[PDB]
Amino acid sequence: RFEVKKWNAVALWAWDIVVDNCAICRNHIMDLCIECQANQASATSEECTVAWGVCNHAFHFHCISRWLKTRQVCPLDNREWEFQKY
Amino acid sequence: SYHISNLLEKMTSSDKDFRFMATNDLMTELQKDDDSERKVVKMILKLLEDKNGEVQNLAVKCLGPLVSKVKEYQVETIVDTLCTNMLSDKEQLRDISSIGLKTVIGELAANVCKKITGRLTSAIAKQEDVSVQLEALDIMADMLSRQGGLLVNFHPSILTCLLPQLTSPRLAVRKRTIIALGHLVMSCGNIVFVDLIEHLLSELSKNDSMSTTRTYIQCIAAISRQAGHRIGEYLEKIIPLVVKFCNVDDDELREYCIQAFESFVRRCPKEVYPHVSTIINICLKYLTYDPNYNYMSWKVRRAAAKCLDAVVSTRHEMLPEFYKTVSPALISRFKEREENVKADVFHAYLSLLKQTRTPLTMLQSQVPNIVKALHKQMKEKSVKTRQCCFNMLTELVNVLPGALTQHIPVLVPGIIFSLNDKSSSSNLKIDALSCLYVILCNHSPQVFHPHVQALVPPVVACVGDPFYKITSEALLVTQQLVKVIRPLDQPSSFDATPYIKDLFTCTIKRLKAADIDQEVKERAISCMGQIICNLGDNLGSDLPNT
Amino acid sequence: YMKKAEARLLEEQRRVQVYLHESTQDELARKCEQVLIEKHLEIFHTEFQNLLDADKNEDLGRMYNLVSRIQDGLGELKKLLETHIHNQGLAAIEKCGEAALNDPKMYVQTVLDVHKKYNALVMSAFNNDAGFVAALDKACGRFINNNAVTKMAQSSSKSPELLARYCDSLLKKAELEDTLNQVMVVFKYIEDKDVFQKFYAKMLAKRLVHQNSASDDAEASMISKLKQACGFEYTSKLQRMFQDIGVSKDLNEQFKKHLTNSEPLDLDFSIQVLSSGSWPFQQSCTFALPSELERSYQRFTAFYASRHSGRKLTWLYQLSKGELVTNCFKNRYTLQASTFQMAILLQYNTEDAYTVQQLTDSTQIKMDILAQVLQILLKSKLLVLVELKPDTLIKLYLGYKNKKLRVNINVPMKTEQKQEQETTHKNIEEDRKLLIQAAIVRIMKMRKVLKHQQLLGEVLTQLSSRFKPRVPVIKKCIDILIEKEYLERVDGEKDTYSYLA
Numbered sequence A: 001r002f003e004v005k006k007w008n009a010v011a012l013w014a015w016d017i018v019v020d021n022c023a024i025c026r027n028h029i030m031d032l033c034i035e036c037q038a039n040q041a042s043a044t045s046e047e048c049t050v051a052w053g054v055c056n057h058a059f060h061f062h063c064i065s066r067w068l069k070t071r072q073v074c075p076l077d078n079r080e081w082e083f084q085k086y
Numbered sequence B: 001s002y003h004i005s006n007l008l009e010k011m012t013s014s015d016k017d018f019r020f021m022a023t024n025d026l027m028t029e030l031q032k033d034d035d036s037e038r039k040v041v042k043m044i045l046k047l048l049e050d051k052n053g054e055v056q057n058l059a060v061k062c063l064g065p066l067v068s069k070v071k072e073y074q075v076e077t078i079v080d081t082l083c084t085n086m087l088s089d090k091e092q093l094r095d096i097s098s099i100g101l102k103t104v105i106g107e108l109a110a111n112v113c114k115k116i117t118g119r120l121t122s123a124i125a126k127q128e129d130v131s132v133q134l135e136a137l138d139i140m141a142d143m144l145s146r147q148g149g150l151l152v153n154f155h156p157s158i159l160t161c162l163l164p165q166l167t168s169p170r171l172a173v174r175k176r177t178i179i180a181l182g183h184l185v186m187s188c189g190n191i192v193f194v195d196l197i198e199h200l201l202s203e204l205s206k207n208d209s210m211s212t213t214r215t216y217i218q219c220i221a222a223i224s225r226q227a228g229h230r231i232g233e234y235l236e237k238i239i240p241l242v243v244k245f246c247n248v249d250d251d252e253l254r255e256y257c258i259q260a261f262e263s264f265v266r267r268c269p270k271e272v273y274p275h276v277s278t279i280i281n282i283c284l285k286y287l288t289y290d291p292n293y294n295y296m297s298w299k300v301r302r303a304a305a306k307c308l309d310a311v312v313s314t315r316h317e318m319l320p321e322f323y324k325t326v327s328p329a330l331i332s333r334f335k336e337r338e339e340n341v342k343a344d345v346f347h348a349y350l351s352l353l354k355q356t357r358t359p360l361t362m363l364q365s366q367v368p369n370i371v372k373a374l375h376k377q378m379k380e381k382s383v384k385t386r387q388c389c390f391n392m393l394t395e396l397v398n399v400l401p402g403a404l405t406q407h408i409p410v411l412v413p414g415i416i417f418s419l420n421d422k423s424s425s426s427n428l429k430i431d432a433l434s435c436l437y438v439i440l441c442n443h444s445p446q447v448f449h450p451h452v453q454a455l456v457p458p459v460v461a462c463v464g465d466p467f468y469k470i471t472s473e474a475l476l477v478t479q480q481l482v483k484v485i486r487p488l489d490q491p492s493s494f495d496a497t498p499y500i501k502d503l504f505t506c507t508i509k510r511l512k513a514a515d516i517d518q519e520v521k522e523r524a525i526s527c528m529g530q531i532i533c534n535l536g537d538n539l540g541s542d543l544p545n546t
Numbered sequence C: 001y002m003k004k005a006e007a008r009l010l011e012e013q014r015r016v017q018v019y020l021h022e023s024t025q026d027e028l029a030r031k032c033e034q035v036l037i038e039k040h041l042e043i044f045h046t047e048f049q050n051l052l053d054a055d056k057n058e059d060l061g062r063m064y065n066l067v068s069r070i071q072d073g074l075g076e077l078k079k080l081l082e083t084h085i086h087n088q089g090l091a092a093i094e095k096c097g098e099a100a101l102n103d104p105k106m107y108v109q110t111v112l113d114v115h116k117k118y119n120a121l122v123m124s125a126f127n128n129d130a131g132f133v134a135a136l137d138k139a140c141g142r143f144i145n146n147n148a149v150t151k152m153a154q155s156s157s158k159s160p161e162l163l164a165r166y167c168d169s170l171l172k173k174a175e176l177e178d179t180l181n182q183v184m185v186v187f188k189y190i191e192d193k194d195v196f197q198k199f200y201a202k203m204l205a206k207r208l209v210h211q212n213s214a215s216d217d218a219e220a221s222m223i224s225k226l227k228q229a230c231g232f233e234y235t236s237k238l239q240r241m242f243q244d245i246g247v248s249k250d251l252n253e254q255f256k257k258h259l260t261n262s263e264p265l266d267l268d269f270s271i272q273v274l275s276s277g278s279w280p281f282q283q284s285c286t287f288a289l290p291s292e293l294e295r296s297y298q299r300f301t302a303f304y305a306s307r308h309s310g311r312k313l314t315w316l317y318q319l320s321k322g323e324l325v326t327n328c329f330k331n332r333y334t335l336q337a338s339t340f341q342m343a344i345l346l347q348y349n350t351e352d353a354y355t356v357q358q359l360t361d362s363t364q365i366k367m368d369i370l371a372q373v374l375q376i377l378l379k380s381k382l383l384v385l386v387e388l389k390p391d392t393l394i395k396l397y398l399g400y401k402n403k404k405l406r407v408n409i410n411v412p413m414k415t416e417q418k419q420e421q422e423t424t425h426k427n428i429e430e431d432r433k434l435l436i437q438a439a440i441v442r443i444m445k446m447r448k449v450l451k452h453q454q455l456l457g458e459v460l461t462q463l464s465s466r467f468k469p470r471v472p473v474i475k476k477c478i479d480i481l482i483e484k485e486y487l488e489r490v491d492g493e494k495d496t497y498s499y500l501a
């Protein structure tokens, strides 16, 4: 017989706008990019990771990097984009 | 003209890269017109609210070189904008403005300081928000660090705003107020120092609360540390209050009092002589304060030991009194059960020995007590305690060459045990070897004769240690050992035959190595030369090869 | 001889001022100095080295006073002092040995002792001259960045990691300000500041999540010192953790207020809700939630979904702890354990034995983590059956006793620290590569056409304050950016790049 006197829990919150998938490319966030998976493997595919912003949105690094060449605005919210995690 | 205009145009490009590059180029330009200044100043000031941290950092960095190449009016408006942003509502604005203001103050004059002082006084005077108080106090301390002598006319106002802050519920405010008060005292007038001193004395005479007395004692200790000679005229009134407060049954209050006593002893020595006796008496009384143990209270013992060290290390014309009363207390208190307090006691006695360099007769008389106290400590499992004991012995032999003539049979086993121990460290072995070398070099060879059989194996083992410092120390010890075993300037009846082979074999391997450090090579050459000089008649066919 | 020479110089000054013409003063002083000091500089250098070996500050000060009269005579002394300080630092670090690689306090204390001793020597004897200060700084940087400890780890990044670990130990659960200031003085000489920043941030996150700090004022003071030393971006990134802590405590308070108007729960509940992008914690491993904690999880999930719309919660069960009270033992005990320990402990109450192959399926725990937590429990005198097999039988051991009612059976795993350090170092490497790429993109955006050496100089100048980049890394970054159509090589005029929009 064991009883739980108290519990201290830690949780992380993220946006539910997308269900565990990138927004620019509609694939799993933990998988490869569309360009990376369509093209042959190389040194570029090694650095394929997920990127977070101040607005707490998660995209593939390649996807957001390609998006930022022409526009300077986060795809989901119209605020300016700023990298904060890799 | 066109370059500056292009940079200003690019600083609003809605792209972070262009803004960063324009700011970097501008900063490079100012490190190597008139209407253009009114635009670049506004651009720099409004870049502190940017949406990118890198641009804000570049703007703060650019705030430095800017003020040294712009008219005084724009410097004044920059200062005013930063000061009024310091009391804003956004946390980022407050932080960035504080950083920028510190940058502007650090590199730099009388007009801008006068402008800043009023705003800082107004901010500190208010007690509604504590973050603004802390930032303003830090900025004021930074300002008083350098070019603080220009603010002669604002010193009474600075005192008036600083003094009530020593009662605020937050402790950080009190600490920053103490720091600011020390910086103010370092450069100020006579009247401000005076009325500050009597304000502190009046606040100490009454006991409004237990917490305030601690911070007042801390403040007077800080002022004593900072000014020094200027507070020597008021010790006659300062000391009785501290003596009275020492008797209060608060552990935290005693430590501050003893630290204040140490500060008075160290910083102002000329006008502290009359109270030296009572300071010493209080320290001796409180050095053994431990109500929960019989043979958080170690702080007062540490403070007492440090104060005794300070009073011993600074007064040279009182050695007879020291050897009369202080020394037996420390010798009896070598048995502390707390490591830090024991280290402080050992440091105090080491300082006494260094100051000893007649007191020699009394030190000789006290040597047996020191030996009896050290014998129990040398068998402990703590490396620091054994290191302290070995340093103590080394210093004692240094001051008296023949101090340990009758205590070798009880001192050698401790060195032997420390030499061959798996738990011993390299520093402990080096210290033990150095102590053995010093002992051997300052005593007659006859006393060590019954102990050669026990001393040779550990030294020979230390010669072959993988670490080269231990090998060098062992060779240095072996040279003196071979000098002692067969003296040439005196007649001896000792038989050195059995140990010659071991002493030669431990040395020849180091001698012909061709891969060892230079120090080991030189020590091996010297040791082999001494061995050939002192025992050349007993070596066989190895002499030609050597 | 130094005292004799000083007395003779004073006597000559007296002579020439009393009974000689004033035009002879400069010539007599120069001739006396040349005869007395300049001719014995070779002996003075050896004496200087000997006095450096055996600490004698007064003699060093007298020598500094004597040689300062000779034109360009202090350079050799500065070089000798720099070499001596470097050798002393290396020797002091080497004596620590194997223990210094895993004992941050010893390493930092040795460095601080050497620096303090020679800084005091420079102030007291050499009158705080600029050249001697520069020599001390160069020597300090040299033996801090490279030493015996760094050679063992085969990397120069071990020193910032040890400094960060020392700071964490100091700030865990009046003299603290002095040692923090000393650490900040040490931090100036470190060239790889990004490693220190990353490790300090991760350990501060660990302190804040588990609520184990000595005092908040110490943290505020350290943040202020970091602001003074580092930039504004790093402090801005650190402040988000404090903001999230405040938001989390407010949310916990308002949830406790809400729980009054409902059925009370069976346990005391505290929750730390953190932003996913402002904290270094990764996704938790798979874990089957035990039946006793379902009610609290469901209640808080419903509450969070009620207040916030587009937010979903991810639960990190490896950072969650609690207290277990037990009564089916020899006596009454309270147990402090993590969620995994509770899962592998509360899984059976009246049962006595289980098989690990079945326990892992029941609790949905991976192999290595389950093995580590089971061996932690085994070493804790709370479970009995060194090697673990899937068919091994494990049974609860009755009759266990403790010397105190309160027991903390939550001890860190051995492999966890090494894995964390390796992962942090790797992540620093990819971060450095990404920063180099971003900088190259920035300069190519500002300057449309640029050469190679100018680009390298600009990159090193811009990234200097954080780390010193290596040329092969920069070349690899340029090559990978070319493949991604960010910049292209112009036809002809070899070794020249142009930005491509």
Ligand SMILES: [Zn+2]
Pocket: A022, A023, A024, A025, A026, A027, A033, A034, A059, A060, A063
């Ligand atoms: Zn994608």
Ligand SMILES: [Zn+2]
Pocket: A032, A033, A034, A036, A048, A049, A060, A062, A063
């Ligand atoms: Zn990709």
Ligand SMILES: [Zn+2]
Pocket: A053, A055, A056, A057, A074, A075, A076, A077
């Ligand atoms: Zn967004």
